[PDB]
Amino acid sequence: MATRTQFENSNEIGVFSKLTNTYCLVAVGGSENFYSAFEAELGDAIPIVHTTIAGTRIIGRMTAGNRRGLLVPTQTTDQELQHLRNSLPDSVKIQRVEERLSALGNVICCNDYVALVHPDIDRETEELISDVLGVEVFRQTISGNILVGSYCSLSNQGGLVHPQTSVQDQEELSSLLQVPLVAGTVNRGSSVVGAGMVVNDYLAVTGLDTTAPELSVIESIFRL
């Protein structure tokens, strides 16, 4: 359900958090109502993890993982990797990618069966992603906005893109992923969609400034 919250006072929860059907991630930001965006909406289904990777707080725009595996960047360290290992289940794998880029959550956009990757990624990461996730990868574009982990959110049953995406590109991505999508905004006209929110099989989280004509289309496109 579209549960609206604020991390500290910003609305981009896809920046400071992360969500999938095996683990949930959150930065150290207080404001216990934010943590109640998943402590209340779940039982003991999946574990929440309070982390600050690389001495940072933007875990969503630095980690691009999946239901069955995770990509953590090179700048991080074993001290923040070991908690992310121990307090998570062993059905999912954690691996420091040793590649040039760092902001995985703005070059990768992936769900449990399909993916979308930046065009100029190393061909070693091109294979490591499938070695650790077994997911198929399609590195062309979104609309010319080569950054994909910010202008695209993905469930398995629904995704979303930004307004300037062409009528040709929305149908191209529909054909690629075999999942519908809409050229929807988030948080009152902010087109950074994959960072202004996050979604899962049943759960959606957006900003407290977000509006009802966007909650209503989120509830349609992402759920079923």
């Binding site: 940072t56 707080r57 933007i58 725009r61 902001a103």
Partner: protein, 136 residues
Amino acid sequence: SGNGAQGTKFRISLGLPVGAIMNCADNSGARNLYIIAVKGSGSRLNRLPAASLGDMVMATVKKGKPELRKKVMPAIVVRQAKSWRRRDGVFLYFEDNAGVIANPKGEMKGSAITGPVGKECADLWPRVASNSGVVV
């Protein structure tokens, strides 16, 4: 200093002061930024105020897109050359001073950032992380 600046920073050594002409890393059509003033930035006689990494500036464009120049605009510096210190002790520095154009509330105007970005800026302005390809 909280005009969209989410967190709160330590001191980063002030490399580029006013009168500086730093590149523009974003795809707004611009090419450079002439810094005129800095936010916060208290006063002292004959001290000209400076900008550190991750800070906001009021700035002006000199080269590119006549639609843009001849008016001031908020900007966000994301690369500098004066070597500063992370509290881990190691010192770092870039090769070029570079920034981004933004609105007063720290939100972006461009679609990307052509180049790397500082960790002190990404964690501080969150919308920069929503467009950053590389963080250092």
